[PDB]
Amino acid sequence: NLDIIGKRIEKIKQEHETSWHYDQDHPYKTWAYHGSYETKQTASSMVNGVVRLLTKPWDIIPMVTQMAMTEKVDTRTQEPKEGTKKLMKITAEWLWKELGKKKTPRMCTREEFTRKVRSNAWKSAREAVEDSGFWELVDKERNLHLEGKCETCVYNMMIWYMWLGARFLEFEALGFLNEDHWFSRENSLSGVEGEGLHKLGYILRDVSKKEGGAMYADDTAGWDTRITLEDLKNEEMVTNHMEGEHKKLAEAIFKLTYQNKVVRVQRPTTVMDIISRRDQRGSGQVVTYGLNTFTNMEAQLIRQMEGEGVFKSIQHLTVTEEIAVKNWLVRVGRERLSRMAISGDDCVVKPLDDRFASALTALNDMGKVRKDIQQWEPSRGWNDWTQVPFCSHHFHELIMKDGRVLVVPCRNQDELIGRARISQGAGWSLRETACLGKSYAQMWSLMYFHRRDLRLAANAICSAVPSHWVPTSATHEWMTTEDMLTVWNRVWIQENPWMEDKTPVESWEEIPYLGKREDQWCGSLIGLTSRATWAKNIQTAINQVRSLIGNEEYTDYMPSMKRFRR
Ligand SMILES: Cc1cccc(O[C@@H]2CCN(C)C2=O)c1F
Ligand SMILES: [Cl-]
Ligand SMILES: [Zn+2]
Ligand SMILES: [Zn+2]
Numbered sequence: 001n002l003d004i005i006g007k008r009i010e011k012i013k014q015e016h017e018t019s020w021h022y023d024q025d026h027p028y029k030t031w032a033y034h035g036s037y038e039t040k041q042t043a044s045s046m047v048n049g050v051v052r053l054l055t056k057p058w059d060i061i062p063m064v065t066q067m068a069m070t071e072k073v074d075t076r077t078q079e080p081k082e083g084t085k086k087l088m089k090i091t092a093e094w095l096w097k098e099l100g101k102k103k104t105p106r107m108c109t110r111e112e113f114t115r116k117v118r119s120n121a122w123k124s125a126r127e128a129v130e131d132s133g134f135w136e137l138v139d140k141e142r143n144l145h146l147e148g149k150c151e152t153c154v155y156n157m158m159i160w161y162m163w164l165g166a167r168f169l170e171f172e173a174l175g176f177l178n179e180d181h182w183f184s185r186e187n188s189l190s191g192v193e194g195e196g197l198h199k200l201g202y203i204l205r206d207v208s209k210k211e212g213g214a215m216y217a218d219d220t221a222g223w224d225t226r227i228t229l230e231d232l233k234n235e236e237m238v239t240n241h242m243e244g245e246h247k248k249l250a251e252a253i254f255k256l257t258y259q260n261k262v263v264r265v266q267r268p269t270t271v272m273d274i275i276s277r278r279d280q281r282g283s284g285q286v287v288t289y290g291l292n293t294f295t296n297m298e299a300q301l302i303r304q305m306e307g308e309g310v311f312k313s314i315q316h317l318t319v320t321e322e323i324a325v326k327n328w329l330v331r332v333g334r335e336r337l338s339r340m341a342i343s344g345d346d347c348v349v350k351p352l353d354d355r356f357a358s359a360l361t362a363l364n365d366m367g368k369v370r371k372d373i374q375q376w377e378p379s380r381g382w383n384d385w386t387q388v389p390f391c392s393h394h395f396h397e398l399i400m401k402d403g404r405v406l407v408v409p410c411r412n413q414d415e416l417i418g419r420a421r422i423s424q425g426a427g428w429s430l431r432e433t434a435c436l437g438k439s440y441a442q443m444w445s446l447m448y449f450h451r452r453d454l455r456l457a458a459n460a461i462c463s464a465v466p467s468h469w470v471p472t473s474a475t476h477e478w479m480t481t482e483d484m485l486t487v488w489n490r491v492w493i494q495e496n497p498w499m500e501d502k503t504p505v506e507s508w509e510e511i512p513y514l515g516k517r518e519d520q521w522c523g524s525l526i527g528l529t530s531r532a533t534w535a536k537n538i539q540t541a542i543n544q545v546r547s548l549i550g551n552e553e554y555t556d557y558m559p560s561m562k563r564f565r566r
Helices: 002-015 049-053 056-060 062-068 082-099 110-117 132-146 164-174 197-208 229-241 244-258 285-307 319-337 354-358 361-365 413-420 430-447 452-464 484-494 516-521 529-536 538-549
Strands: 261-265 273-277 340-343 346-349 394-399 405-410
Touching: 002 261, 002 273, 049 430, 049 452, 049 538, 056 062, 056 413, 056 529, 062 413, 082 229, 082 285, 082 319, 082 361, 110 164, 132 164, 132 244, 164 244, 164 285, 197 340, 197 394, 197 405, 197 430, 229 244, 229 285, 285 319, 285 340, 285 346, 285 354, 285 361, 413 430, 413 452, 430 452, 430 484, 430 538, 452 538, 529 538
Parallel strands: none
Antiparallel strands: 261 273, 340 346, 394 405
């Protein structure tokens, strides 16, 4: 305990020796209060005017306009039963071994870390890299870990954050998981890391082709808050596949920063509290993704074991049941992993049959309680892969006029237009705002070409922003100045392993839409008076934005669509 977190607490107290206090009215029951000190300080979502001027009909849709305006953390999950714990340990050992069969754990390097900083995700961290003083501090902490101690690895609430140095040490020990694609479908069988939103539909359709029952897509309630110390210890077992320095460095990150967290949090009552918890997820956005994918893969194999009647009770695992679990994993584990599509806390499972639906004892006792359903009510499965929710999307099967088959991503169009109308942070020039608009427009042309309103608005934004201006922000092929019909052909035809005939598409009229009623169901404004006026007069809205940016080189993309041809 304090033997691992002490120094960090001691260091902070010293830097604030003239404002320390052990407030006895602290609002913490599940987090351990250590003290506070004087603090004073706070980012609200701003509107992208380029996108908003070119999406006027949506100015009166509350679902869109309300997106731009604007408890579970202090909870405790019970220690699972012993049979649950044995199931998890056995499954986690086997999964780490399967993931490392065709992969080599290895350290990430300052050079890799630096290049990422010089390319985005001392003031800015891009300045600390050059200052060797920073790296001197890193080595200090680094040699501090090698002894099994930490002093500078404390999270700052507000998506917790850490000093760049601590981020590097986590990257040096665990970066290999994302950088070498451990949760790729090829290597994990259930994973989709790096697979792309033009690939998720095809994946779900392949899972659908397997013999079995319904497709289940149960979202967990506050997954980040339900990670047990048992899960963190099962995650740590990746170190068993490591060697030398790496093995000790990874062990330290798991022991000192994950399985023993120290966090600073603001409290208006403004006294910065210093709480400590050994449970829940408190790592990187990228390591969190991969460890979430891993623990979700483990939970879903165990839920599959329970449906298939591999174990009878979680209270205790018999020696015979252990051999049965191990034999099940060795005999059908890879096939069972291929039945799932997991992305961090998000999953779709096509189990052997619908006994899975009522198999809830292990899932509930692991703490992975389902959202918006009664703890013991059986799961509502899906009978059609095109209505399954995954990664905030559903997928449409769409037949091209030449009979070739596209599987396309889709979501409620209010959500897509609402997100494009928002810019994160401040100090945006007109040009930087125009180029963020252009990133949305190019994404829409690539992924959402099949929605009539988004193809039209994407053409309008690309016509309203200078042709040579560069778009600025798994697979983001819209982040380019290349012609969008050429990127469409590469993504949907040339590089698409589900498409046998590689004949390029010659124009945008050969690229199909959803049904008109399909379009409206998914939130299109086709058939509204406001939308017809918007379309008819689109060249006037384009001209308004062009007049604001000024006399630059612009290209007219509206003649790509049939109606705008003279
Ligand atoms: C381009 C276009 C313009 C106007 C109406 C349209 O379709 C109407 C409106 C919704 N719906 C199911 C229809 O049949 C349309 F597609
Ligand atoms: Cl139709
Ligand atoms: Zn440390
Ligand atoms: Zn849809």
